[PDB]
Amino acid sequence: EPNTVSYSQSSLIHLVGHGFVHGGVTMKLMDEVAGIVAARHCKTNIVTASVDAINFHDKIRKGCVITISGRMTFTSNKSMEIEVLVDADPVVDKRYRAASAFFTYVSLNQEGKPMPVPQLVPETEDEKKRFEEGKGRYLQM
Amino acid sequence: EPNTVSYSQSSLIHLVGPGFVHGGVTMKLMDEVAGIVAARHCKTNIVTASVDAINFHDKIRKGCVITISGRMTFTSNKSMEIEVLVDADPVVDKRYRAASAFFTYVSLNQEGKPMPVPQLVPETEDEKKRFEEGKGRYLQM
Amino acid sequence: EPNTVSYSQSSLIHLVGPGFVHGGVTMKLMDEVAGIVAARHCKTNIVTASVDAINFHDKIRKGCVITISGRMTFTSNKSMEIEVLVDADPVVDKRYRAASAFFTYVSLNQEGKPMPVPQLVPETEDEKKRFEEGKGRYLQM
Amino acid sequence: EPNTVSYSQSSLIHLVGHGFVHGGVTMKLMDEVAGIVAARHCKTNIVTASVDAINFHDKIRKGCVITISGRMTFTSNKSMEIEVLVDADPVVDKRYRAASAFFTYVSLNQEGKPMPVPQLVPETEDEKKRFEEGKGRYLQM
Amino acid sequence: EPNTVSYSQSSLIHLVGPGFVHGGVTMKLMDEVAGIVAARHCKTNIVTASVDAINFHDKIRKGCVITISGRMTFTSNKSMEIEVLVDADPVVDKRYRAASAFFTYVSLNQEGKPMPVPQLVPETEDEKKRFEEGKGRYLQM
Amino acid sequence: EPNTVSYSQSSLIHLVGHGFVHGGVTMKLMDEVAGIVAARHCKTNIVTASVDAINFHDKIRKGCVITISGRMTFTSNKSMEIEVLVDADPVVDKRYRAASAFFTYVSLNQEGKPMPVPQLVPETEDEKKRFEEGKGRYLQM
């Protein structure tokens, strides 16, 4: 199971206490989850190279519990792509998709450059397809 | 299925940043989850009455993600008992139980005094078990 | 000169405390500046719709002061694009571009849906340029 | 005076700024005071082993100054018990007891296990009695 | 005994976490105590007018508990002077004076301008002393 | 340009989110800017020795952007004086002077005492005059 999607899949879950949560609070939390999955996959130092298609689908209010999930989608020789999803749940009554993004993470050698990365191996058809999509987005750079 | 364990079963997941985390930080996070399961159960504004047997099974190190899970175990007339379990998951390199506590919460009217509490019905045998034991601790008040 | 680039041109400057700063922190600060240029432009209460092409050009180290600058580039009917640039300035010992992003913001009425947006008029050639390119990215929606 | 109750007695005093202070904020602060007294008594690394009878006597509101006092009550060979009290004072007009708890602290050797602890010596009748009570609570574990 | 030094004599005690603490942190905490003694004295909403002679006698290290004490020294018609003293107490291993300042505070009406201030009556000789000197500094405005 | 006023001139710019900003928040931020200029001038460890004439000219409200500027004014053999200015700008419509102060910074040797400091050289008439004023304030200690 090392270097598979299920091995590094991670989530965080937060109680967020005008009235709605800033995009920045959400972005930061999305980057932490992606960091966590990058970290589980690599076991080295890890840093955000770029972030694409941060889309806020709709607002998040005070007293929601948000579930920030991450799954690795694709790896090049020296980079990891991680899809991050954000769901929001009211503490009284249902679950809705609030944000999503693709993070590309990099692992740095002692001179601050990307180094060879363990390769993600897509096992299911879902994973093979997301890998293929990841490859596409990466070649667009 | 309101007023069941499964109904208000709640958890939070936190990346531990800056190694040991001092008990105080964990306790606070345990109260957060406890608050959430209580608000889901009774739907009123909510306050902690007492906490018992906080056990730190062992230390929580930086770079762990902690799952803080909470389930209701028993309800008295005016009070609720809620078990909170903390699990620690190192990201590099082993998952273990880090802490546990029984929180007794109290539902308040819009002045001061605590109002009566919606009853909790167990369904599985283990839920039956836990309720007795819950019952038990209460009695010793 | 309301509704020009110069009108709502905004920036923040932060001392980085405790070395790399994780992408998440910078992203949040980029959103803060983006929010400020948008509120200056349209004067309504303001929310982030999406963020694109967040590029981390390279790492931001502790003991840097970062200039986070934001200028509006283009306005659709209901949306605004805002370029945010992050510059890093070590205090001891070299200044460099650290990150850049295009934020699309949205002006909201006092319920939910986004209201129409005050148009942006470019004046210099470079502003003309940037607006096209802005226009461009929008189209690809 | 080393290893006596008066030597390590400590307090912290905080201005706390729906309207009432969460149990978690109070618990955390109680653990810090107990940590401080454990630290004064030992002069080694120090960690919470367990917490018993956290009782919230009544609420704490914004703009109260809280006095969190700690006194060591009992020591076994490898553990310290510390009573923590929390008083709340309004900034205009009087002082009331808000919370109390017993913390048991441990000192860890380089392999993460409790090590021999300096022994508390109760000098007054009050201290001898609290020691005896402490011994009782400890044997209950 | 309202409007005496003893009436509004206030202090806070803080555990310094993460070694030197930068002046800024201490200054902020000195203002907090100053605010508290002023609110106790006049009972109106309260704001700092100026601070003088902040002296850092020497450095405040991590793992110190600091006592920040404040007493009123003098009242003009519209203003109050308040001396704040900071004491530092290492927990392991020596207690010393770390900083001192004279804060002049101002009582505000429910619009803008500062309202008149309740007079302060000294009683001990040292209080007499301090009031003159207080008087003195004011005059030099 | 090393050791001139322009070389170490620094600023920070913050979005501040009863309704007005505490003097303490402002003081802290003023000390950070002064620290930054002291740091640019010295390239060694740096600490606040004292602060004089913190004057709050008028209030700062939520949703203002504040510009905290620092410029070195004077150096003795072993100390640096830095003038700090604070301007406040509403996010809708103009700029006003909110606070000012003189910080004196010191650079410490390994035994915690001030060490010889690079000398500020005033190049313009404005700078020569502020130097002279700085010398005056310093001899008053």
UniProtKB/Swiss-Prot annotation, chains A, D, F:
Top-level taxon of origin: Eukaryota
Sites bearing N6-acetyllysine, chain numbering: K59
Tissues where this protein is expressed: Widely expressed with highest levels in brain. High levels also found in thymus, large intestine and testis. Negligible in muscle and adipose tissue. In the central and peripheral nervous systems, displays a predominantly neuronal localization with highest expression in cell bodies and neurites.
Domain HotDog ACOT-type: 6-111
Expression triggers: Up-Regulated in activated macrophages.
Region annotation (Disordered) ranges: 114-141
Active site positions: D31
Biased composition (Basic and acidic residues): 126-136
Chain's role: Catalyzes the hydrolysis of acyl-CoAs into free fatty acids and coenzyme A (CoASH), regulating their respective intracellular levels. Preferentially hydrolyzes palmitoyl-CoA, but has a broad specificity acting on other fatty acyl-CoAs with chain-lengths of C8-C18. May play an important physiological function in brain.
Domain notes per entry: Both HotDog ACOT-type hydrolase domains are required for efficient activity.
Quaternary state and interactors: Homohexamer.
UniProt-recorded name of the protein: Cytosolic acyl coenzyme A thioester hydrolase
Species name: Mus musculus (Mouse)
Primary gene name: Acot7
Residues of the whole record sequence present: 220 to 369 of 381
